[PDB]
């Protein structure tokens, strides 16, 4: 693993740690202090090194969890919840649905869609991010 | 305005470019949420924060020029609006006992990382001082 210096370098060689929308930066913008689940998901969704397990579908703010277990694992590591899993993550996403932030796409599993006005908050359009991230639509 | 402008504007002020990001350091240590010592290392490696916190040029020694400001940013980062240096100082005693941070004897608001921070971070003190254009005191 080496030192932190090596850690940053090793991950840079793998094209990691370059998200378009960093969760910590977004948390500072919204004033939430610690990062929240929706900010974490936007970071993963704008980090090309994460497309193997989470990605945009190409339809607006819709995204899918190709590997829900890996998303839950990374969330647990990010928040020091070693027992984090999809079941708890799903319950969390259910709370976001009540506040009309994230909705589930019927007919497809592990597919969700940001329903709030994300374009006005972030200053990015859905298609703009898709182009940057080389999103291949489903 | 928007988040994009928020990133732009702050970038023009050379903000948000710390050598040791706290969240990145937390990922390296596996701590999950950032901890106070990581938060301090971010500020200490953020050129835009040198007005209220900076190194002294002597190894891992650093000083809090505006101890009230560093506490405000710590409270805003952990949703503690009533955070003040009086409370923040209480939390620093934990790092005293664990021989992570020590107060410089005979100097107030001056501390030093007494752990092998070079082996952890991979940086020497002089290296970060040069990158940060620190003026020794």
């Amino acid at each position: 693993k080496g030192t932190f210096k090596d850690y940053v370098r090793d991950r840079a060689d793998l094209n990691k740690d370059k998200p378009v929308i960093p969760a910590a930066a977004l948390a500072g913008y919204t004033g939430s202090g610690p990062i929240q689940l929706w900010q974490f998901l936007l970071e993963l969704l704008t980090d090309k090194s994460c497309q193997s397990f989470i990605s945009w579908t190409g339809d607006g703010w819709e995204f899918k969890l190709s590997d829900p277990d890996e998303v839950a694992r990374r969330w647990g590591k990010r928040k020091n919840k070693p027992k984090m899993n999809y079941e708890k993550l799903s319950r969390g996403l259910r709370y976001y649905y009540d506040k009309n932030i994230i909705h589930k796409t019927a007919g497809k599993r592990y597919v969700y869609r940001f329903v709030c006005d994300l374009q006005s908050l972030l200053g990015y359009t859905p298609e703009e991010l898709h182009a940057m991230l080389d999103v291949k639509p489903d | 305005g928007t988040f994009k402008d928020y990133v732009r504007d702050r970038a023009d002020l050379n903000k948000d470019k710390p050598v040791i990001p706290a969240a990145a350091l937390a990922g390296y240590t596996g701590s999950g949420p950032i901890q106070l010592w990581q938060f301090l290392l971010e500020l200490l490696t953020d050129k835009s924060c040198q007005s209220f916190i900076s190194w002294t040029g002597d190894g891992w020694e650093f000083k809090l020029s505006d101890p009230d400001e560093v506490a405000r940013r710590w409270g805003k980062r952990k949703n503690k609006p009533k955070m003040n240096y009086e409370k923040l100082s209480r939390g620093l005693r934990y790092y005293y006992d664990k021989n992570i941070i020590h107060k410089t004897a005979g100097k107030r608001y001056v501390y030093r990382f007494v752990c092998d921070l070079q082996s952890l971070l991979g940086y020497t003190p002089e290296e970060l001082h040069a990158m940060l254009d620190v003026k020794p005191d």
């Binding site: 610690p34 929706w38 976001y96 932030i101 908050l121 | 999950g32 949420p33 952990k78």
Partner: peptide
């Protein structure tokens, strides 16, 4: 939009 706290006994928010 507003992002009110997400803190429940079945889904507790982390802090420290």
């Amino acid at each position: 939009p507003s992002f009110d706290s997400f803190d429940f006994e079945d889904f507790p928010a982390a802090l420290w």
